[PDB]
């Protein structure tokens, strides 16, 4: 649909105060500011994978049936004559 509400993000969860926090955050920022996230989006997500036959298909079929019926009627008239 159209609307887009409650905009948030995705995070890499950790413990409470832990020695692997600031380095992970800085690495995420450094990957954002160059083209690595763009390459990932290209490979995984960004990669992508009138007619006049809706209300006239049945109409065309019925027209063909009527044409066949008219041909049969022509044959009947020829036989009558």
């Amino acid at each position: 649909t159209g609307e887009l509400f409650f905009r948030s993000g995705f995070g890499i969860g950790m413990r409470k105060d832990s020695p692997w926090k600031q380095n992970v955050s800085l690495s995420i920022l450094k990957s954002h500011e160059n083209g690595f996230m763009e390459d990932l989006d290209k490979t995984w997500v960004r990669y992508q994978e009138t007619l006049t036959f809706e209300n006239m298909a049945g109409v065309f079929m019925l027209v063909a049936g009527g044409i066949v019926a008219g041909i049969f009627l022509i044959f009947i008239e020829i036989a009558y004559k």
Partner: protein, 305 residues
């Protein structure tokens, strides 16, 4: 500048202030010297610039011609002109007369089919008129034209205001782009916008929230960004703090609380207004010109015979 900062970062690092409220992106050097809270508005950097239907119809027309030939065999000059008469009566041009009953019935049925087809064509024209599209010249910062303007036939111009995160990121990413960009270092957003109108400049590279707002409140709706935007360095705005300041946890939790119940959406609606003709048939006229060129070529081909 030589291990010397200035501005809001300069006032925060050297303890002349405790936080810097204003608009301020997030990147590696600033995160190394200070501490940022969670982003509450997202702003990257972006760019601102000013088949078988005919076949089945032909098959049915051949069927009609065969029916007309059969009618002529049964019971005057409409042998090879049956197609001509049928397609002339398609458009009801009154071109200067059916006589057989079967021929009249077939002509009437095909006229009804042409009527429903022209009604569908009017509906298609209405749908096409409803459909409206803009034109985007540049696809991204790495567009073919942006690769080397001098190489391209027109040496178009594009610049950004220096002394910014945007300039720094472009310098780190693509040196040639910066080399060419240096010539048009127009200062200030307001002064920059005017050159875009006059044509002295062609493209503009800046934040995304700023450009969205300035396109929204523009009078006349002449300038339009390219696609969604945030086409690179998708970042947010933060509230700088001194390293280790005890306010960080409380400020983070408060900002998350505000975001989680629609107050930020209310503020965005209140302070940012995002809005959103004449007859033109250039494509149709070009198609008509191509079709008439084909017709006259066919006539020239048949000229010898």
């Amino acid at each position: 500048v030589n291990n010397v900062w200035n501005g809001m970062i300069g006032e925060v690092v050297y303890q002349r202030a405790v936080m810097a409220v204003g608009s301020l992106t997030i990147n590696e050097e600033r995160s190394e010297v200070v501490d940022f809270s969670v982003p509450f508005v997202e702003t990257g950097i972006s760019v601102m610039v000013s088949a078988s239907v005919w076949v089945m119809m032909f098959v049915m027309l051949l069927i009609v011609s065969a029916i007309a030939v059969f009618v002529f065999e049964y019971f005057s000059f409409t042998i090879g002109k049956a197609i001509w008469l049928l397609w002339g009566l398609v458009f009801n041009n009154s071109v200067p007369n059916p006589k057989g009953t079967t021929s009249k019935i077939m002509v009437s049925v095909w006229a009804f089919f042409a009527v429903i087809f022209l009604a569908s064509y009017t509906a298609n024209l209405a749908a096409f008129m409803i459909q409206e599209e803009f034109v985007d010249q540049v696809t991204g910062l790495s567009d073919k034209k942006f690769q080397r303007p001098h190489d391209y036939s027109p040496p178009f111009r594009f610049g950004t205001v220096p002394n910014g995160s945007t300039e720094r990121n472009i310098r780190n990413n693509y040196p040639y782009m910066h080399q060419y960009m240096t010539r048009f270092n127009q200062r200030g957003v307001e002064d920059a916008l005017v050159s875009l109108k006059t044509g002295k400049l062609d493209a503009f590279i800046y934040d995304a929230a700023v450009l969205n707002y300035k396109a929204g409140r523009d009078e006349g709706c002449k300038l339009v960004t390219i696609g969604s935007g945030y086409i690179f360095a998708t970042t947010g705005y933060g509230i700088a703090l001194q390293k280790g300041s005890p306010w960080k946890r409380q400020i983070d939790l408060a900002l998350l609380q505000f975001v989680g119940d629609g107050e930020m959406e209310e503020l965005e609606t209140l302070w940012l207004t995002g809005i959103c003709s004449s007859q033109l048939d250039i494509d149709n006229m070009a198609g008509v010109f191509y079709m008439l060129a084909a017709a006259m070529a066919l006539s020239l081909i048949t000229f010898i015979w």
